[PDB]
Design a protein around this ligand. Structure first.
Ligand code: HEM
Ligand code: HEM
Ligand SMILES: C[C@H](O)[C@H](O)[C@@H]1CNc2nc(N)[nH]c(=O)c2N1
Ligand SMILES: C[C@H](O)[C@H](O)[C@@H]1CNc2nc(N)[nH]c(=O)c2N1
Ligand SMILES: O=[N+]([O-])c1cccc2cn[nH]c12
Ligand SMILES: O=[N+]([O-])c1cccc2cn[nH]c12
Lengths: 412, 412
């Protein structure tokens, strides 16, 4: 009938009717395509579907390392099949889970730090059962991951999905994130992107401290019950104060950002089993903070003013003042993280690494799922290698799917 | 079996086998997909296919302007049908051709200057018949288009394809382009991207002047005959000397570039009819010269040295020296074109315009074919609006398809 299209900048929406007149023989520019999402359930996974996937995975895992263990393979294959027919679902050996997480990461077409896919700390929280218990596992995660600035990649795996009405889910987009408050005088303070979610926290009893960098509360839902609100212990949230290595007035901007990039709302699918809650984290890439968080008009939007303070022709677009500015914001981010001994990688070194990984991936298994639109840094495109590298985007398994925002499909 | 992937940077090739293990339910990152190419022929277009397309077009053209001319419509419809059944193919009224070119441009998903789609000079050369005659039409084109710096968009349409063995084709990638010579001492002088083609010109009798900016010869093939070589009159090729508005040493780089961006090897398809030769041109966008031509490692590659001359940490990647440099090269390009009174638009203003166009397009006809991967400038991505705009890529009609390089499918 018509496809909806969103301009994440102005938020505006559009309905494309013209595409119907296409000749035939692409949704690559879409953000959250239903092909990359794995929604809710109401009934368990039909055994006929589960068994095939489960069998494949056990073959992937067992046919993973050098010199196989056929005895164990066929044994596990059997033990797994049986468990499925007797219990319905099944449990992955801790080793399998570890293998599962690293693979799913490895199979993440939008990630650029996949060269690190093997170095990942795994926290088995499959035995968890309450919100308070989640909050604890999450805190442990944050503490381990942060590591006083020397960031360590980790993922905490909560109980897999069973029937559907019993799902473990973190409502936050990511572990640490700033709140966005709509001020009385119309202005928007904080992270404009978290406006709607900040409200939900308010509605659930959270006390808004109306500031620019107020760390949002953890909103967790265990088993199936309603989400409970927990504030993250301030001692656990390490931040970095933004300061330029030449511009003294940069510190006067009063900017800062959290050191831990931990995605909290994705679903890890593996061997037919799916875990709707599994927060993971790596470390930041400069451009993410300096270009996205800081310069997007839908976020902190600091380009206009960082420009003036540089004596740039803010009103003459062709002067390339925007190019000039963002780069200085980037050096600030990079410089500040380096100065405050917090791990971070610049987009150039990062790209060179993905290219290295990508080639290691084809040589190792003839392939590497890669979404160009996401891998190319928000700045200095072609100055980067990945820009010139053609790539094939495809969903393998295990995989880290997206999921329908919980506050939509959830009866209280 | 396996899909081939090219790294246009190092030129390296790869075979993707892994994609076979995909779940299912994307080739968006590919350069020349067969879906965007319209190859050779050996027999005319089967009447059963031609008539339907032809009919549609006549409906598009006639149902174009306000208050239709039904009398003429049904009349043209008839006159066209008849002509097809009696002659085989058919001729477009000059008006239709004009409408055809503007539409095809309008339907170009990779173009960012489509807001200009209505302002396009059309040169009807459908009566042409020889190479020498082509060269003349092309020169006239260059002269009109250049207009002493005030660039004007234009397109010259040569005789449409008939049977297949009688094709008019320009062998050049674009009207004006620099030669790339492989030097004795291993080094590559000029435009490395034109290495193979420069050789073809040598093989066809062209005399190489072994320089950095030697304008390549026009290689045209008329009717069906072999391609003839013609040198473009130097008085017709307007260039711009690169100089920075602050760096005196920039002029010392000895850089320069042609002012006319004229794509010469594409095929205009319309109402079933296809014209394998129709060179068009608009005006340059800063980043194209400064970022692509100048900074691509596969081109003039000037980043390394422009860096040093700026006293940048050329050996410390994290210093963001590359970001800093390219921006200065961009200001040079932009500044030089402005100073030498030659039309050119910066990527920012250009993007803002495409966004304006895109919205004018949905409001006017609910759609606008847009390939994100191509519309997003090679630098300052998210600093641009189009980066955040989701878009649908689809091939409409009329369309400007690519085509198999002539020196491959051509018996002498
Ligand atoms: C170690 C450093 C890492 C870096 C530098 C890094 C960087 C990135 C970047 C730049 C993106 C795009 C994010 C955006 O613009 O919204 C991304 C996406 C992603 N990363 Fe990585 N990452 C790292 C580690 C990890 C780890 C440890 C995992 C998983 C265990 C992972 C899983 C993913 C996934 C699934 C996405 C997609 C998120 C989405 O679609 O919104 N990454 N990463
Ligand atoms: C008036 C100014 C114009 C500007 C600023 C402009 C700019 C651009 C840019 C940036 C691209 C991508 C080129 C690349 O990176 O390789 C492009 C592609 C294209 N443009 Fe436009 N353009 C303009 C006019 C035109 C005109 C007059 C036509 C046709 C009559 C046109 C047809 C196309 C086509 C078909 C492509 C695709 C070429 C390819 O796929 O290699 N453009 N243009
Ligand atoms: C691999 C990738 O498709 C390729 O290097 C690209 C991408 N997008 C592009 N964008 C433009 N405008 N022009 C190009 O040459 C390319 N090349
Ligand atoms: C419309 C477009 O898909 C969207 O704005 C993009 C594109 N690529 C991206 N790239 C990354 N890494 N992260 C993003 O949020 C986006 N968003
Ligand atoms: O930009 N990043 O660093 C980034 C983005 C998205 C997910 C992760 C995990 N670690 N770092 C990430
Ligand atoms: O970059 N450009 O200006 C550009 C690129 C590709 C085609 C045309 C035609 N005019 N300008 C063009």
């Amino acid at each position: 009938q018509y496809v909806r299209i969103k301009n994440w900048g102005s938020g505006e929406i559009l309905h494309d009717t013209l595409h119907h007149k296409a000749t035939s023989d692409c949704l690559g520019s879409i953000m959250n395509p239903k092909s990359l999402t794995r929604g809710p359930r109401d009934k368990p996974t039909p055994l006929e579907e589960l068994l095939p996937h489960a069998i494949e995975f056990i073959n992937q895992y067992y046919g993973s390392f050098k010199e196989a263990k056929i005895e164990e393979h066929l044994a596990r294959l059997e033990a797994v099949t049986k468990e499925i027919e007797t219990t319905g679902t099944y449990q992955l050996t801790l080793d399998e889970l570890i293998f599962a997480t690293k693979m799913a990461w490895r199979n993440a077409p939008r990630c650029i730090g996949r060269i690190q896919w093997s170095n990942l700390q795994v926290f088995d929280a499959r035995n968890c059962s309450t919100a308070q218990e989640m909050f604890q596992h999450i805190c442990r995660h944050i503490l381990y991951a942060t590591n006083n600035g020397n960031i360590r990649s980790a993922i905490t795996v909560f109980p897999q999905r069973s029937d559907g009405k019993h799902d473990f889910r973190l409502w936050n987009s990511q572990l640490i994130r700033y709140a966005g408050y709509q001020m009385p005088d119309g202005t928007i303070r904080g992270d404009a992107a978290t406006l709607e979610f900040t409200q939900l926290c308010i509605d659930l009893g959270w006390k808004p401290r109306y500031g620019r960098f107020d760390v949002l509360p953890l909103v967790l839902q265990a088993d199936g019950q309603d989400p409970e609100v927990f504030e993250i212990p301030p001692d656990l949230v390490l931040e970095v104060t933004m300061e330029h290595p030449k511009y003294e007035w940069f510190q006067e901007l009063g900017l800062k950002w959290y050191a831990l990039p931990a995605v909290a709302n994705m679903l890890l699918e593996v061997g037919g089993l799916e875990f709707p809650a599994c927060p993971f984290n790596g470390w930041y890439m400069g451009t993410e903070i300096g270009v996205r968080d800081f310069c997007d008009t839908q976020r902190y939007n600091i380009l206009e003013e960082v420009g003036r303070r540089m004596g740039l022709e803010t009103h003459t677009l062709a002067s390339l003042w925007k190019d000039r500015a963002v780069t200085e914001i980037n050096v600030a981010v990079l410089h500040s993280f380096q100065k405050q001994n917090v791990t971070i990688m610049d987009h150039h070194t990062a790209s060179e690494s993905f290219m290295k990984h990508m080639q290691n991936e084809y040589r190792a298994r003839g392939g590497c799922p890669a979404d160009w639109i996401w891998l190319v840094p928000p700045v200095s495109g072609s100055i980067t290698p990945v820009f010139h590298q053609e790539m094939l985007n495809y969903v393998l398994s295990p995989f880290y799917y997206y999921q329908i925002e919980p506050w939509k499909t959830h009866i209280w």
